[PDB]
Design a binder for this molecule. Structure first.
Ligand code: MG
Lengths: 63, 348, 243, 18
């Protein structure tokens, strides 16, 4: 469960792609710190649910 | 110019540079030659760190201590085939008797040995026909003896249970007729000999040679001895032993020129030196094993080093000096009793 | 600091120069900090031959003697050394334990497989490995990793490959050019180094070793990225392939 | 000049490394 710090990339079915480092991993949701979107938007806090998730890749490990 | 690319720590520096100053003091010893990168340059270095194009292309400019293509003698595989063909032409020669036939084998760990034995048919039969045949040896290029192919089958069965992660093997005819000296604890010995090769093409057997003994009498102490210093061997048998050495080296050097020009090939702008190994048999017959280029001169101890000095003298006197002197040099030279000109030629 | 290194580099190389070529000293320093500072200070920039050579001209302009151009002098140095260029590959196994070496038909020294009128460095390496080993290295070649040293004129540029199969039945395409091919336990080579004859590998025992470590951390962690890729999918709910 | 200043700069590298 201690998957914190692992910078992950999330590809989505809506047409969007979101990178950003993981803050919380739960069976219902994935929460991201410093989330960068392939639409030109950067936010410091993102909450995405299990259901609204399509593709995932684990970009980098923690420092 | 004198390009001594070889390491100063290395053995043949004091015997080679002290002869490269005794004969050529008006010439300058230089370490690395890639500064200039047209006149006369001699270069003594190591095969891998030598410039080949600069030698086969500017012949009268560059001069070295090695020939480029010369695998016919140095490589065991090419050596066995070279004497075989020379003998299949001139059967009258000694070479066949002196030669201890040695095969090689590509053995991938997964791959069987019958298939890597069927890979070398030339060996297959030498092991298949056994009637009175010489007991064979297997170098791991451990050291073992056999006669059957099925004898060798079982040796290869050992290797896995003993570690194996080895591909290249050598098979040679091991003869149990050696010379056991009561003065030497009957320790098994072989002889190392230095041959010199000036241009296209002169051959010189250096007649000071070393007897090298394995510490175990059967498979008093004095590791390396000049063979010309053995008090046990008679002088009239010792000199015949030397004669056989001179005849083998005669028949085996031209046996390369005349077989295929592309395999062994000498340059008029270079000179070469090899370690011709033999073995004295019980009935006082010498049997050669291998000719090696850039041999380890260090083997001849720190005592018996003058053996390597007198050699480096005669290699500079008969090889490096005519590069810079006159054309009168040839008829002016005097024959040393320990540097015999076994072969003479007219290039190409 | 970053400039404390650049300083020390000139103190070791640029200052060993007196008393009596400076283009080699410049290449050597660039190699030192390219095949050592890279693996140790991973953040730092991998500045080129010309660039790093210019970088010194701005900080120590007292060391430069003539009025001849920077770029013009590196052209001149490469112009001098333009005899025969050599390229090769250092092929390591899957476990990063052994390197695959070749021994020539004329020499008993063990070097990396090495050796075109128009083709580039990568095509030369692919073609020479395919001719001396049989394995067509096309699939494994990474263009951004290599070591370089010029031996008495000839330039040697060796590429670095890992994950190659130990089981593979290697055989030469050119039969009488490569006498033997064998895998060498890396740890052993390092200990044997100073009876067995090794050509180029000896000049790069340190960078090869460092690179092996780098290629191991990157492999061990890449495994924990695949682990977590799975370990997160098998809990992050609705995860499949609909398209 | 360079010879002398070199006796002051290289000192800040030997004394800091080991
Ligand atoms: Mg095979």
């Amino acid at each position: 469960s201690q998957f914190v710090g692992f910078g992950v990339q999330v590809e989505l079915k809506d047409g969007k792609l979101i990178q950003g480092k993981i803050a919380k991993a739960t069976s219902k949701g994935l929460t991201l710190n410093d989330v960068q979107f392939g639409d030109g938007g950067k936010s410091q806090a993102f909450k995405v649910r299990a259901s609204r998730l399509k593709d995932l890749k684990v970009l980098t490990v923690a420092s | 110019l004198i390009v001594v690319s070889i390491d100063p720590m290395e053995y043949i520096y004091k015997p080679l540079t002290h002869a490269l100053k005794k004969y050529l003091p008006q010439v300058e010893i230089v370490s690395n030659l890639p500064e200039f990168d047209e006149m006369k340059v001699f270069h003594y270095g190591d095969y891998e760190q030598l410039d080949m194009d600069k030698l086969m292309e500017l012949p009268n400019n560059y001069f070295t201590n090695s020939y480029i293509y010369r695998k016919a003698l140095i490589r065991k595989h090419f050596l066995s085939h070279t004497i075989q063909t020379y003998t299949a032409k001139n059967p009258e020669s000694i070479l066949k008797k002196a030669y201890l036939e040695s095969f090689t084998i590509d053995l991938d760990y997964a791959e069987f040995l019958d298939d890597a034995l069927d890979e070398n048919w030339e060996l297959r039969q030498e092991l298949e026909n056994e009637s009175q045949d010489k007991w064979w040896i297997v170098k791991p290029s451990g050291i073992r003896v056999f006669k059957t192919i099925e004898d060798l089958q079982a040796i290869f069965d050992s290797f896995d249970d003993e570690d194996s992660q080895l591909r290249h093997f050598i098979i040679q005819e091991y003869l149990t007729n050696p010379l056991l000296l009561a003065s030497m604890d009957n320790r098994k010995f072989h002889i190392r000999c230095y041959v010199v090769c000036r241009g296209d093409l002169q051959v010189f057997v250096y007649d000071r040679m070393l007897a090298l003994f394995a510490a175990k009498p059967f498979v008093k102490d004095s590791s390396v001895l000049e063979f010309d210093s053995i008090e046990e061997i008679p002088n009239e048998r010792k000199s015949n032993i030397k004669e056989q050495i001179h005849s083998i080296t005669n028949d085996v050097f031209l046996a390369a020129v005349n077989v295929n020009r592309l395999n062994f090939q000498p340059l008029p702008n270079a000179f070469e030196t090899y370690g011709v190994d033999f073995l004295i048999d019980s009935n006082y017959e010498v049997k050669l094993l291998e000719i090696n280029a850039f041999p380890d001169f260090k083997q001849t101890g720190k005592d018996l080093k003058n053996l390597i000095d007198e050699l480096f003298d005669d290699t500079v006197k008969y090889c490096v000096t005519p590069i810079f002197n006159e054309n009168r040099n040839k008829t002016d030279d005097e024959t040393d009793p320990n540097f015999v000109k076994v072969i003479d030629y007219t290039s190409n | 600091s970053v400039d404390r290194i650049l300083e020390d580099l000139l103190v070791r190389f640029i200052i060993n120069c007196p008393n009596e070529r400076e283009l080699f000293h410049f290449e050597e320093a660039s190699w030192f900090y390219t095949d050592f500072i890279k693996l140790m200070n991973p953040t730092l920039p991998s500045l080129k031959i010309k660039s790093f050579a210019q970088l010194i001209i701005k900080l120590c302009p007292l060391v430069w003697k003539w009025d001849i151009r920077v770029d013009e002098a590196l052209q001149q140095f490469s112009k001098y050394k333009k005899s025969i260029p050599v390229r090769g590959a250092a092929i390591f196994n899957e476990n990063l334990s052994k390197i695959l070496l070749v021994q020539g038909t004329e020499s008993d020294s063990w070097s990396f497989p090495r050796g075109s009128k128009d083709e580039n460095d990568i095509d030369c390496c692919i073609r020479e490995v395919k001719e001396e080993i049989g394995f067509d290295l096309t699939d494994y070649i990474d263009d951004n990793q290599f070591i370089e040293r010029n031996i008495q004129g000839k330039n040697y540029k060796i590429f670095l490959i890992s994950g190659v199969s130990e089981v593979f039945n290697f055989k030469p395409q050119v039969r009488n050019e490569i006498d033997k091919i064998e895998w060498f336990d890396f740890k052993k080579i390092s200990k044997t180094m100073y009876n067995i004859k090794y050509y180029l590998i000896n000049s790069m025992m340190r960078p090869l070793s460092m690179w092996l470590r780098h290629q191991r951390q990157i492999k061990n962690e890449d495994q924990l990225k695949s682990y977590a890729e799975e370990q997160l999918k098998l809990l992050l709910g609705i995860t499949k392939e609909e398209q | 000049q360079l010879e002398f200043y070199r006796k002051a700069l290289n000192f800040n590298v030997i004394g800091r490394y080991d």
